[PDB]
Amino acid sequence: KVIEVELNDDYFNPNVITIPINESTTLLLKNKGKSEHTFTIKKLGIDVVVESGKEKNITVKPKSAGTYELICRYHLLKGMEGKVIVK
Incomplete structure (x- = not known):
């Protein structure tokens, strides 16, 4: 059920993620890059810092x-962005 998201230098993989409304979804964030990265969805108030070579889970339940x-x-300015679709 978990959705894996690779964080690398300097991109998300995948960069478009779709998740169900009013339900809980677990994301496994794996930072494979040399740099520290964040997984940030400001409109959902989500912000997770993932250290280089490490990983974190987050569970999201969008309304x-x-x-x-x-x-x-x-590393936003290197083009490191994507989209999360709640439906």
Whole structure:
């Protein structure tokens, strides 16, 4: 059920993630890059810092359908962004 998301230098893989509304979804965030990265969905108030070579789970339960910007706060300007779709 878990959705794996690779964080690397400097991209998300996958960069478009779809998750169900009013339900709980677990994301496994794996930072395989040399740099620290974040998994940030500001409109959902989500922000997780994942250290280089490490991994973290987050469980999300969105209440509003929509498409929300995903960024890394550290390497945004290298084009490190994506989308999370709640439907």
